[model samples]
Target chain A: TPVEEAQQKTIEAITKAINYMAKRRIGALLTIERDTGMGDYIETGIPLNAKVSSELLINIFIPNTPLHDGAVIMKNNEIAAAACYLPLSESPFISKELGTRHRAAVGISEVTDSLTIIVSEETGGVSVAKNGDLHRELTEEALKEMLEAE
Target chain B: TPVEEAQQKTIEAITKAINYMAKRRIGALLTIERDTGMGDYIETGIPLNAKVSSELLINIFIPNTPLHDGAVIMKNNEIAAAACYLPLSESPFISKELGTRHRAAVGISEVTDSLTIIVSEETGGVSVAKNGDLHRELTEEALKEMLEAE
Candidate 1:
């Protein structure tokens, strides 16, 4: 139950931070680890093991931050790691405007059930990847629903 | 929206047939196509283009049927093709009991954002593959939710 509580708290934090970043035109890639183990997909990253919070997420996604480039992985509702490299999707169906992060999010989701959330650094819109399907331009409520489903 | 309705109808019919087959220990492989084009993954199959119906699905999945050996591609909630070959997943996370059909389902889903549903002929169990994650021993209600999500 504590783990669930932590996970829910972090989900709220991430959703809030995502919208905040969207307003400021900040880019972000966040992954919520699911049943599938992400051992092979993620490469090197800074291990934070930090509790998920809006402030910490905002700082990590902020420009000029080292952890801003790669994906931030949430394990058990905590920031398990940051700046972790993910595979880039080679699927031809990916949208043209999707950047490397979006592709990476979809790519990883293709091999795992993890939900990959992407905030467009370009359009300042939100997107989510699940089961290899990428839903672009999602609203905060939409993001919350997805996280809630998880 | 009309297409969505057709899709939903087809999804329901397919799930019903899948669970029905599972009850009778009938082995079958079905792919609910989403975004990925089935150009290369399936080159040969009998063109059906039939409506989504439990009777048609049950007939196609019959062990004596020629099309029962390969995959049935469901496009726009219709049986677009039958006896189509699918890619095999090489993920180490797959269960040891998974057969060739189940592996093919996972493999194809990995390459494309498709939902592959498998009914094991031996145990009459149902397994679903999506985004590289395999959910085994799923009940009819669980299958209904996944199809409904589409």
Candidate 2:
């Protein structure tokens, strides 16, 4: 129940953060840690250990901020780290229109079971990266189902 | 189940938004419609009628923004309106240290059974005004309890 509850709360925060960022074309990359431990991956980031909230997430991703440059890792419903570098995806099938955020999102998903949410700064679109697959132009309802699915 | 589920989602958004704004000293006023209908109050605000999310809430409260000037009224789990004005409390016992945001929070609570959450910009403190009584400096856990209680 606790885990479910945490996920539920996280879902709300994530969904709302995505909605706001997408509308304003504020790019964001958030990786949600799943069954696989991101111990090594988390090391690439600045340690935060702060609880996740929509407002905090938005501020972190706002351009020109120190932590806005890299991905934020979410673990146990808390922000484990920020401005973390991720491997870039070199998939030939990837869209040329996509940029660093989507590539990094796919790159992280390729190696682990993490689900990454990416808000495109160029197009103001929402996408999800998982298992080397990218789902683009997702509606709020679609995003909700994907979050709840796991 | 739908109503309960809606409230559950709303609670998460409200909690996260409050947490983020309070830390940044970003002042915010949010009123959640309960059993009391806020039709008249909603009329005072610019109609939104958009689905609720933490990201949207944060954007609306960001200072200097067009919609950031007034209270956001929530009804049926949606943002019914924004930038709406409310009656200011004239209570003699009210603290002089409090500002207009706290007064409006208390004022709305006095007339209706709605719950108002106010994030103080000056001190970055979180408070709840309910039944004309103000509860200040609430922790995340305390805010969660109050949200869930209703």
Candidate 3:
């Protein structure tokens, strides 16, 4: 079952990336595709099409790196692209405390059935966005659970 | 230290990739840089400069993929390049049973201080080459031990 194996590996890699980044207070934005195809957005960034690894994911978000500024889109257990620019949400209901990363996460999820993970550099907090809903301050276990379900 | 952490992660990722590929009988050729700089050969391939992860490693050698044709050069815990063409060993002492992958491994090691790993598609055996010496039929434990020492 390559699909099953890929899903498991993807979750494991994402967990490792989140743990390392959260501890170091590194900011990251990662979006995982579900039923929705993120082709249009994927084209907006540098095509990687590489297998997802925690180390690679962590490296892409190390501040001041060439690919750290935008989102990394993950699809089919592979990193489809990096430094991708996604549509930003301007909803008045959205909190002002949220940064550009958070807004981008919510914006993509609002239109597609994708899940986006965010790590805040300011607070070292982990959050997940899906179906236009944002879950804030998620623990590593909670994050795993959410990803497993997805 | 980040250097130590990167090394550990690199080893772990390599192990994972080897385990998966060996079980599936996928042929792979990976060259890890030591004191030698593989910059010249790296430029002969597509530049990735992405962190090493087992999943990503396995994906690169998935038979028909674009990057599966040549060697993957790893430097500084990152996949510096892939589909790289390395010098081939034409020593009379080399075994006739060896293929292009093994030849390349021995060839690079003969000229540089890098360590190369080869997974045979014909026999599904693992081998390591260093300093022009190729150790064939290595087990998973032996592979890890050798890499750990490196």
Candidate 4:
């Protein structure tokens, strides 16, 4: 279907934008909501509620402008909110290496099986957190696989 | 890989669970996340984080509990989260017969490559949401085909 084809293209553009964010060493937490109740957690956030594109995503997460403080949520494949708050996971299973934002990412994952992406400002590293598991230091292709995959 | 085997088992278990839910007219919402970003839109929900089993799924979605309000999220064929909230779709193109939770089930599919199931508490009818589409009154064989076909 045309929708799916366009979606694939949009996903490619998003992958490129993420790659560029990594290049600039911007720390960001982008949450991708799935078929669960994710909108219930929004607080202290800005609702863009706009169509998703790589440009908009990069502009929102690009270094500074409160990126240092909070998270961004792309709900239903669109930019729904920015600087949203997710609770920290209280689970003892999470490792010490994961910081506050990643833990928050883990928490988001636990809430609805959502995907939480973290861009390390300190290291320009890209990690994906899903099902409460965080995969840090992803290769370019690895990150692309996550995005391009079904 | 062993992961694929686990996935198959989970799929089978979930099929069995859905059959039981439909049999008893147990209203429920079940979501399965594929190879896309899902963990973004989640908050205060039970974190089972366990392997998939039909008995557990049936028990989780049983009627007259807090679980009824929450959705079940599965990733890697494992339970990821439950009782999460999803926003209703504002798509005017959707049929008016669809209600909030069913709309939400469709919304979840719209967001990422995910599938959602809805069981009506009032009617015990089974439905499915996938690829931004809604499917209602799914027969046991039909539901299995929908889940297993792809």
Best by DockQ: 3
lDDT of 4 by residue, A1-150 (tens): 988987786678667767877988867788887777677665456544545555445655644333336677776666666778888878787767667877888888876777778888777789888877788899888987886663
Worst 10 residues of 1 chain B by lDDT: B47-56
Which lDDT tens digits does candidate 2 get at residues A19-113?
A: 99999999999999999899888888766565566755776687754568889998877777778998899998778899988999999999999
Q: Model 3 chain A, poorest ten-residue lDDT window?
A: A58-67
DockQ-based CAPRI category assigned to the predicted complex of candidate 4: incorrect
lDDT of 2: 0.86
Model 1, span B43-139: residue lDDT tens: 5765555555675567566665345788888776566767788878899889887779888999988889988889988799988899998999998
Report the interface RMSD that candidate 3 achieves against the true structure, in angstroms.
11.5
DockQ, all candidates in order? 0.01, 0.03, 0.04, 0.01
TM-score of chain B of 3: 0.96
State which candidate, 1 or 2, has the greater DockQ. 2
Pairs in clash, predicted candidate 3: none
All candidates' lDDT scores?
A: 0.79, 0.86, 0.85, 0.71
Real A-B contacts recovered, model 4: 0.00
Superposition-based RMSD of candidate 2 using all C-alpha atoms, in angstroms:
11.3
Model 4 residue B114 CA deviation in Å: 0.5
Kept native contacts, fraction for each prediction: 0.00, 0.00, 0.00, 0.00
Return the TM-score for each candidate structure.
0.49, 0.53, 0.56, 0.47
